[PDB]
Amino acid sequence: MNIFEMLRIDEGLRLKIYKDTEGYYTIGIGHLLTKSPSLNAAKSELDKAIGRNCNGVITKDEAEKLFNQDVDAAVRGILRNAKLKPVYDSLDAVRRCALINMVFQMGETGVAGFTNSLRMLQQKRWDEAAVNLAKSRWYNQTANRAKRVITTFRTGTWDAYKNL
């Protein structure tokens, strides 16, 4: 298992504009298009992102291209962030994937806000961190996904996904 397979399980693949859990306009493998309520605004962002007139629909290849870009941007973002880099550096490989997963879903800023949990992961207090992470809107809003990520930080294995 690797980061791409992990995120492909959590996000799914849709080839037509769709609404995410929060109601935002999204496409492909979790690629957010706009927070704007307008479907037109969405279609416009899409064409800009692909370089073609897509009329709300893309190919598998196009989905994967946006995906490769998003994963790279997530990793680069952690590495440039002063609160995140040090945590990332401290972690083992599997746990690194779990932090990348969070950043991809909630953005750098969002993740950097989990001050206490970040401290705990740094200190390698797995159980304490799993419990703290669960006290969040995140856990209430996307519970099955949050649980998979949480278990990943907890155990340092891919068991939550070996199922899936």
Binding residues for substrate: 32, 104, 117, 132
Q: How many other C-beta atoms are found inside a 10 Å radius of the C-beta of residue 73?
A: 13
Whether 108 sits among the annotated catalytic residues: the reply is: no
Transcribe 73-125 into DSSP letters. HHHHHHHH-TTTHHHHHHS-HHHHHHHHHHHHHHHHHHHHT-HHHHHHHHTT-
Whether 11 sits among the annotated catalytic residues: the reply is: yes
Annotated catalytic residue, options 20, 47, 64, 128: 20
Q: How far apart are CA 103 and CA 105, in angstroms?
A: 5
Annotated catalytic residue, options 5, 10, 11, 89: 11
Binding site residues, as ranges?
A: 32, 104, 117, 132
Q: How far apart are CA 38 and CA 73, in angstroms?
A: 26
Q: Which residue numbers are catalytic?
A: 11, 20
